[PDB]
Every structure is written in structure tokens, then in C-alpha cells.
Amino acid sequence: MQIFVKTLTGKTITLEVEPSDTIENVKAKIQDKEGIPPDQQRLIFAGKQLEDGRTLSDYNIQKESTLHLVLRL
16 A cells, blocks of 8 residues: 655655554664654644654554654754
């Protein structure tokens, strides 16, 4: 499956995931792709700040969803 990650700056990432992927694992693939440590990553979907230990499936994040990545310090 393909999901997307859209940033405050407009740039788009695309990630291959599974519904059983944890939000933390999405942050790991982002770090594998962009070098951004996972602690600097907040993911949001439908206004819900997604917690690291739940899965996409837990949030009904399905094929071709577009999450929202807000970096932090």
C-alpha cells in the first residue's frame, strides 16, 4: 500500500506501509528516507495527533491517505 506525508513546506513524501505498521514505524521509514529523527516527527491525520504505539489500522488510515508531518525540536 501507498500512503503520503505532506509537510508544512509543501514537499510530499510517499511511503510504503501496512495497516499494521505503527506510527513509530512510519517515522522510522521517514528517518530512513529523509534523515529526520523520529523524535522530531509528529504525524497528524483528520486532526488527530497520532501516537507512536498505535497502528495506521487503529486510525482507519487506508490506501492513499495523506498524513501530515509537523516537525518539532
